[PDB]
Amino acid sequence: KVFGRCELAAAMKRHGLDNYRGYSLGNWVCAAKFESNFNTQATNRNTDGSTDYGILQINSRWWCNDGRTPGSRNLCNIPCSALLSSDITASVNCAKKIVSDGNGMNAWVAWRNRCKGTDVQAWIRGCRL
Ligand SMILES: CC(=O)N[C@@H]1[C@@H](O)[C@H](O[C@@H]2O[C@H](CO)[C@@H](O[C@@H]3O[C@H](CO)[C@@H](O)[C@H](O)[C@H]3NC(C)=O)[C@H](O)[C@H]2NC(C)=O)[C@@H](CO)O[C@H]1O
Numbered sequence: 687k688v689f690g691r692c693e694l695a696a697a698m699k700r701h702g703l704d705n706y707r708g709y710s711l712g713n714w715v716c717a718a719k720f721e722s723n724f725n726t727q728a729t730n731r732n733t734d735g736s737t738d739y740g741i742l743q744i745n746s747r748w749w750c751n752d753g754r755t756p757g758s759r760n761l762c763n764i765p766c767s768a769l770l771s772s773d774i775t776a777s778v779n780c781a782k783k784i785v786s787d788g789n790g791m792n793a794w795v796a797w798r799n800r801c802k803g804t805d806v807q808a809w810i811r812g813c814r815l
């Protein structure tokens with residue numbers, strides 16, 4: 687599923703991401719835009735053999751199990767395929783765990799390079815909400 691900008695914003699707010707750990711809704715919408723272009727089915731292979739999954743490109747080395755990343759961990763205790771559903775519930779719960787681990791949203795490289803410090807409130811402009 688390719689979400690619309692305001693559609694994803696309302697979904698993220700309903701699942702409790704608005705201001706979670708002090709990060710406003712626009713930050714999460716911006717991060718999703720540059721990580722996956724709002725496509726829930728996005729997948730990307732890393733050089734170390736791990737894979738990134740879903741709307742927020744969560745990594746298999748630490749957070750989920752895909753059965754093909756030898757030596758990995760599974761801190762969200764969930765199959766990586768569950769992060770590709772049209773329903774973003776699993777991705778949001780895991781992202782809540784990730785952002786609390788110590789380095790905040792710097793866990794997402796695209797957020798650090800393209801969203802951090804910018805006028806992120808623009809990403810929720812025009813949405814009823
Ligand atoms: C969205 C996503 O999956 N991003 C991936 C990053 O999570 C990952 O970076 C590494 O993440 C781990 C787990 O959060 C970091 O470990 C933590 O380190 C801090 C101190 O910096 C400490 O508070 C924690 O104890 C420790 N957690 C543990 C041990 O469970 C680690 O610092 C990150 N490594 C880096 C930044 O080099 C990167 C790299 O694998 O991939 C992203 O896709």
Ligand SMILES: [Cl-]
Pocket residue numbers: 795796799800
């Ligand atoms: Cl980047």
Ligand code: NA
Pocket residue numbers: 746747748749750751752753755758759760
């Ligand atoms: Na794993």
